[PDB]
Amino acid sequence: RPVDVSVSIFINKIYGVNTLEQTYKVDGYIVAQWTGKPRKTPGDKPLIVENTQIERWINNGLWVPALEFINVVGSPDTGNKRLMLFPDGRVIYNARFLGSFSNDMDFRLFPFDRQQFVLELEPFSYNNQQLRFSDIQVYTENIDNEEIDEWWIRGKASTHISDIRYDHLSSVQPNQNEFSRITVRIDAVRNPSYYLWSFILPLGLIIAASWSVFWLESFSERLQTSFTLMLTVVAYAFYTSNILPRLPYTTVIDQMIIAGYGSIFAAILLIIFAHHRQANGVEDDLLIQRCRLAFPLGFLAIGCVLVIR
Amino acid sequence: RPVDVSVSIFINKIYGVNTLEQTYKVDGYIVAQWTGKPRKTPGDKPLIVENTQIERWINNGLWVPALEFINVVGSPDTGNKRLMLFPDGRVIYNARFLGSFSNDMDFRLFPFDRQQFVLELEPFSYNNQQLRFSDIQVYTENIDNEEIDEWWIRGKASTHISDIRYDHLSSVQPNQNEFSRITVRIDAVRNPSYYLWSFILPLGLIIAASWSVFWLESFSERLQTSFTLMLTVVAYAFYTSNILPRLPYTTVIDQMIIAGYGSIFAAILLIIFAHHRQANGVEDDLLIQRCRLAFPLGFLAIGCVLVIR
Amino acid sequence: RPVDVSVSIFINKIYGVNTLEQTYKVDGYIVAQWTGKPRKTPGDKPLIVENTQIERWINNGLWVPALEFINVVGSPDTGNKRLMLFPDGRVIYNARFLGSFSNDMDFRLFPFDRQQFVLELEPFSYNNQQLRFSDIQVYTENIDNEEIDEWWIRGKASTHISDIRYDHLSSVQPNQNEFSRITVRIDAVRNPSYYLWSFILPLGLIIAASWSVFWLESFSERLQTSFTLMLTVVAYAFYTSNILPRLPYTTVIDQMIIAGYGSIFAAILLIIFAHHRQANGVEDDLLIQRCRLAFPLGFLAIGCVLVIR
Amino acid sequence: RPVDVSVSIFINKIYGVNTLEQTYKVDGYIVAQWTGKPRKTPGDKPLIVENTQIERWINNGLWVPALEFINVVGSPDTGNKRLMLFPDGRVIYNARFLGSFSNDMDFRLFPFDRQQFVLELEPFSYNNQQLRFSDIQVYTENIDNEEIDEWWIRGKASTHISDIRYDHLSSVQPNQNEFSRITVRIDAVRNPSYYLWSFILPLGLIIAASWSVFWLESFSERLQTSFTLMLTVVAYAFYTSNILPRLPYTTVIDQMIIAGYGSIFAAILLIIFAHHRQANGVEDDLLIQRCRLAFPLGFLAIGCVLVIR
Amino acid sequence: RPVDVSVSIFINKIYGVNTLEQTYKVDGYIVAQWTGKPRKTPGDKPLIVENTQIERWINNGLWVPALEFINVVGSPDTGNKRLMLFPDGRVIYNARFLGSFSNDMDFRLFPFDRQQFVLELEPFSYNNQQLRFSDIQVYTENIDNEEIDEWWIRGKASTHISDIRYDHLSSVQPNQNEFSRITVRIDAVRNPSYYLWSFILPLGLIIAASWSVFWLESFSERLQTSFTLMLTVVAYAFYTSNILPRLPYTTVIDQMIIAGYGSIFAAILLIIFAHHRQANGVEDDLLIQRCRLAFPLGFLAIGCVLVIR
Ligand SMILES: FC(F)O[C@H](Cl)C(F)(F)F
Ligand SMILES: FC(F)O[C@H](Cl)C(F)(F)F
């Protein structure tokens, strides 16, 4: 009894990740085929109906089922519409769309995270007793120049037809509450180049050269240099957070920065201590200089336990 | 006599809080059911009317009352509309919406604020003598990975149908001035993660380490260094202001920063004081040295009386 | 002859002031009542016609005159429309609007300026021989938590019906160049809180401690520290300009910064001077030290004639 | 043979110059008058048609020619449309518009540039054999409290009606390839106030005090300080470009900053030279000190011959 | 059998490249000519149908094939539409458009990159058995004062009609899967001035002057300065990244900055090494001074082999 509808989704561009909103843009076309009461067409050739005309055929009683992108955020930008009406009953709906879609996204592993871009498609009014998805095909471009792309799309789309029970329906009871839903998935990993070389590396180099505070010979030189190193971290904190995507949690890079702030406060506690440890007023040289290769290990080992995954 | 309307609101996403404008975005569906004069439907089965076709039934006189979101800011983006016409009189309105909504929002406890996301729903044209809200259902998705969300939704939505006296009317007098209104409330708190770890903590380390100025032994070392400390607070003031939400009042971090400005201006006053307090130019190294844990308590006390609540 | 129309304007939110464009947003409702040729209504009860149906009645020849917001910038976002048609002739137009409005805005005393939010309403086609405004009512909410509002609405709203002569007309001549215009005024003052505590004050502490450059005892110390003070000002300029509203002129704050810029250059010239004022190559430490209160007073005096308002 | 069209343009606001896009915003009204087939109006008084109704009259065969703003960027926001239909034949089209317009804009003398704001209006479909522009009237308010205005309008609008021959037309040949085009010009200059006091002047004070490095005593003092002077220029470059208009070229202010970078690199090149020029290792203070007026004049001499215009 | 369509594309402005999205905007006209069943026109002169009227003529069965821009991103803003209906059958569609287009864009050689802006035009429904592009003419303005333009368009546009096989179709079989496609390409190179003079050059000047650490005479001086130089580079990274285009990879300038980061970390390592390389702990001033001409040549040699393309 229920009508079988065949869907094909051609994906043109996935662009513009919104990190705070957990959304993304997808441009492509959607195709839908189903079969109805056969029809008299001008010539025994299939009939083509574009854009403003489809509305007219609907007023004469053509059944064109509303298919909703569930995880889209607000009505998508619809390009051209097409009905290809075959004389032998079958009907093809073809539409181009650009829409900003929503999905759960964990950005904690930035810049080395993998994400999956999803489309969720479901009919708006007719349940699986009325309209069901027979099959789903998703086609993607084959990207070869992905090294100039922000994201490396990682493997072909996965498809998934299932049924959804909306328990709370104000309608009827026997199975009038289940709807048939297509789900498209595309896996991807982030192109970590720019973030590796232009952010991670110099943060290391800076945190590195911070240790070279201990090879200054007076105390006065060492503590005062600590305040210029101090400022540099704040500056580097400002630099990253202004360019990196805003998020509600700490990333890898964010943590290196918290680590950089610690190492600098750490030295200030010691440099000030070594000036006062033992009697004689001795700048505990017994302590410093031994720190010239103590801290680069202390930071680098107690820093080797950031396995938050 | 009055028409009874039953409302169901499905909430999909509450995102994009706007601090300055006091708004937030809500994507969902809204459902309204009422019963009218029973009807001839094709088959004794309910009738489904999608989108552009609803306008047609209106011109032939189907009564579909406009229900307005009172606390929206501008006409919402409405996705698919749907009428389900049952033969036994009952009528179901189903429409998807995305809208920017307004409510009172206090951000003084940032990053530890609790908010109320609110919806207020009321008919646009018909009073409670004519149309009244019978009951209200609000459904919320269940967030399990809340550690990657901007906001933690805290408990299920509370609702309240109420009545409103509109004083200034051009209509008539006998009981023609009250309207039926749904009010949905959702409580939520901010995910304080990114801000404790990447803002509060280094502000402490910076504000703490400002104090290590008193462990320099020269006067020249002490006064000149605090000016490097001065630059560091403005840079940190600059960092915060660029990333934290724009507001028309001071937050806690805002106050700590001013305290940071004070702690350093205060210090410059003592350093200059202890050098000329006593006769002969003897540097009062009793005031200094006493300051080495005088300030870590004074600030830590005058900031421990930021109990403004 | 001319139709008297009674207007009521309900204001919900005045938000989103744009300083550079001198615009602001207003959300509210508008009511217009006038009386025409009496009508057949279903029941002796008034007829309610919403949204898409109003357009229909215009085509059957119903007169609904277009009332234009003079100072709106672009087509306002119209929410729900409603006609209330009375059997006794009279007609009530009700529509919700959100719109961006323009008015002259002087921001020179920022953050201590007062602005007035203005609405200017005038019919689009019909002069006052045809359509004139009988009376105008403006209703505004009671801001109770005004300490959490950015703008303090200061006294209830002002109203004023008037007539406007359009000299340059391509029409006729006979007093057909005058139009009936409602002009709503709302005065408001800026909540100067955030800017005092987080901008004016720390700028003071910074400008003040600039003066403590004269209590360094060396010439090298005094001269070299001022270059750091210099850096501290440029830094503070960047903090302010990036956060404060952008304008085509200098504000109060904009000037303080220029003063700090001056004072440091003033200090640099003295600090470099007292090193060469007297013969012997002796530092006129009479001059400096006089400066420990020449600048804190001199700057504070020739800068205390900042009665520029 | 051709229909004469008389145009009136009332300009309400010119705002929002986009420096990078070379565009500017214009709010106003446009009025076009022509004379046609005399007509029956209800009563012997002219007829008014508003908004949605103009379309209806177009369908019963009223000619209202589409007039295109040639240098607009994308379809403009048309507020109200109004048709005034005269019994003696004349037809007056009155429409309010807000649109983003384009013109070549050279911003190289910023902040001392003059721009001319242009409107170009031409019929979309009809040539000068068919439709021609009779006259163009442009009405502008006179902005007198121009001191809070970003731009000083250098007098009332100039116009130029001409004919434009389009080579590549797919139409017919004998004189059917020329179109009637109005060109409105408004001249204006930028108010250099804000940019003089808040950008030009403190850059001068800083570039000036940069020179006060030659008045430090040891070579260590002299060289170590210019690296802080260096940091200061970079801090100031950042301040400007983040607030000043975005462009594809160097401005005046841009160059001042390049000059400051030069002066400081120049001083370092000299400071290091005067230290090793002679044998004995003796400090060549003949070269230094002479530089105390070499740079303050050299920059001020080689910098007042920037007659690049 | 198939209809020949002759296309003309007039390009008005190419503006607003989005580096991240790999998009750019194009304003222009499109003209399409084909010949159909001849027609009786009012007078024996061609008929002009504008905008809303074209819509009407379609509903009575005028064939106007919808032509889609393949690589536009979202529904472009259609300006005026015009049908010119000739009596001898031919039909000309002319419409103005503004749209955002996508193409692969490689920005690695910034600011010296070349881009080609492409337009790809193809019918939405009709194959080359039904509709084909006969010829394509492309018209571009001649940029004469191109020195104020961000992009230099380099030569006339190249065009190419070709045919496209779509494999995955549910439609017909005998040659029914191929579509006709116009492809326009426009070459352009970037105006490298502003980025050369305001970014590359002062970056050189700073990276150079960084080297002058080796001419300070104390170890204390040389090392403490490296930390101030360190700060200057972080500042300069922030300035560039905030002003320059966002990309997913490192550019030439991004590389210069990493080099400055390296050179400074390089020196810190040597300065600290030269202090302990030799026995006695005496500063190996042999290594130093040799470094005064090691780095400007070493950096200039191993950095002139960044021919990475
Ligand atoms: F306040 C400062 F941080 O400003 C900039 Cl980044 C510095 F350090 F270069 F001066
Ligand atoms: F960074 C260096 F310039 O050192 C500190 Cl921040 C200054 F500016 F005070 F000199």
Residue numbers in the entry:
A (entry chain B), B (entry chain A), C (entry chain E), D (entry chain D), E (entry chain C): 10 to 318
Paper text:
For ELIC crystallized in the presence of both isoflurane and the agonist BrPPA (presumed in a desensitized state), the FO-FC omit electron density map also indicates double isoflurane occupancies in the pore. The bromine atom of the agonist BrPPA co-crystalized with ELIC produced bromine-specific anomalous signals in the X-ray diffraction data collected with a wavelength near the K-edge peak of Br (0.9199 Å). The anomalous signals and FO-FC electron densities revealed BrPPA binding sites behind loop C and nearby loop A in the extracellular domain. These sites were reported previously to bind agonists, competitive antagonists, and modulators in ELIC404142 and in other pLGICs4344. The observation of isoflurane in the pore of ELIC under desensitization conditions could be attributed to an open pore-blocking mechanism. By this mechanism, isoflurane occupies and occludes an open pore and then remains in the pore when the channel desensitizes. In contrast, isoflurane molecules in the modeled desensitized pore moved away substantially from their initial positions and deviated from the center of the pore. In contrast, mobile isoflurane molecules inside the desensitized pore increased the RMSF of the pore region.
